[PDB]
Homo-oligomer: A and B are copies of this chain.
Amino acid sequence: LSTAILKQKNRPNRLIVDEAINEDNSVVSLSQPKMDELQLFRGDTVLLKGKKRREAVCIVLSDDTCSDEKIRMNAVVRNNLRVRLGDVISIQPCPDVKYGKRIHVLPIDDTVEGITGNLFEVYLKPYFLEAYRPIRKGDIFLVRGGMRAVEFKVVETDPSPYCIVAPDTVIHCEGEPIKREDEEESLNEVGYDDIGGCRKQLAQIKEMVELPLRHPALFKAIGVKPPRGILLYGPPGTGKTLIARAVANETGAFFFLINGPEIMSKLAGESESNLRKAFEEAEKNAPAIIFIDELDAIAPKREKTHGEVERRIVSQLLTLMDGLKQRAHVIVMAATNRPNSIDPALRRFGRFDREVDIGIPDATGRLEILQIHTKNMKLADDVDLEQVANETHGHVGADLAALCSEAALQAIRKKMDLIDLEDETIDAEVMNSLAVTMDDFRWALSQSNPSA
- Report if A442 contacts B (CB, 8 A): no
Taken together as a complex, chains A and B put the C-alpha atoms of A2 and B412 apart, in Å, by 10
CB nearest to A316 among chain B residues: B265
Q: From known contacts A349-B398, A401-B349, infer whether A211 and B421 are also in contact, taking CB-CB under 8 Å.
A: yes
Among candidates B5, B49, B266, B404, residue contacting A416 with C-beta atoms closer than 8 Å: B5
Which chain A residues in 386-417 approach chain B with CB under 8 Å?
A: 398, 401-402, 404-405, 408-409, 411-413, 416-417
Chain B interface: which of A73-81, A93-101, A151-159, A212-220?
Answer: A212-220
Chain B interface: which of A29-37, A124-132, A303-311, A361-369?
Answer: A303-311
Q: From known contacts A315-B297, A409-B207, A413-B2, infer whether A181 and B378 are also in contact, taking CB-CB under 8 Å.
A: no
Among candidates B237, B265, B268, B405, residue contacting A225 with C-beta atoms closer than 8 Å: B405
Determine the chain B residues whose CB is within 8 A of the CB of A318 once the complex forms: 261, 265
Which chain A residues in 247-299 approach chain B with CB under 8 Å?
A: 259, 261-269, 272, 294, 297
Taken together as a complex, chains A and B put the C-alpha atoms of A349 and B315 apart, in Å, by 30
Is there an interface contact between B310 and A308, defined as CB atoms closer than 8 Å? Answer: yes
Q: From known contacts A221-B434, A225-B405, A426-B217, infer whether A309 and B310 are also in contact, taking CB-CB under 8 Å.
A: no
Closest CB in chain B relative to A354 CB, distance in Å? 9
- Report if A319 contacts B (CB, 8 A): yes
Chain B interface: which of A40-48, A64-72, A164-172, A321-329?
Answer: A321-329
- Report if A85 contacts B (CB, 8 A): no
- Report if A380 contacts B (CB, 8 A): no
- Report if A227 contacts B (CB, 8 A): yes
Is there an interface contact between B315 and A413, defined as CB atoms closer than 8 Å? Answer: no
Taken together as a complex, chains A and B put the C-alpha atoms of A374 and B224 apart, in Å, by 9
| Contact indicator per residue, chain A 426-452, by CB within 8 Å of chain B (1) or not (0) | 100001001010000000000000000
CB nearest to A224 among chain B residues: B408
Determine the chain B residues whose CB is within 8 A of the CB of A348 once the complex forms: 236-237, 398
Is there an interface contact between B312 and A265, defined as CB atoms closer than 8 Å? Answer: yes
Taken together as a complex, chains A and B put the C-alpha atoms of A14 and B422 apart, in Å, by 10
Taken together as a complex, chains A and B put the C-alpha atoms of A259 and B316 apart, in Å, by 11
Determine the chain B residues whose CB is within 8 A of the CB of A1 once the complex forms: 413
Determine the chain B residues whose CB is within 8 A of the CB of A344 once the complex forms: 236
Is there an interface contact between B325 and A185, defined as CB atoms closer than 8 Å? Answer: yes
Besides A222-B434, A223-B376, A261-B319, 8 more A-B contacts (Cβ < 8 Å) are A185-B326, A218-B419, A222-B408, A222-B436, A223-B375, A224-B377, A264-B315, A265-B319
**28 pairs across A/B with beta carbons < 8 Å?**
A4-B417, A5-B416, A179-B327, A181-B327, A184-B220, A185-B327, A215-B419, A215-B421, A215-B425, A218-B412, A222-B377, A223-B376, A223-B377, A224-B404, A224-B405, A225-B405, A236-B344, A237-B348, A237-B349, A259-B322, A261-B314, A264-B315, A265-B272, A267-B269, A268-B308, A294-B345, A297-B345, A307-B311
Which residues from chain A sit less than 8 Å from chain B, CB to CB?
Answer: 1-2, 4-5, 7, 9, 11, 49, 90, 179, 181-182, 184-185, 206-207, 210-211, 214-215, 217-225, 227, 236-237, 259, 261-269, 272, 294, 297, 302, 306-312, 314-316, 318-319, 322, 325-327, 344-345, 348-349, 353, 374-378, 398, 401-402, 404-405, 408-409, 411-413, 416-417, 419-422, 425-426, 431, 434, 436
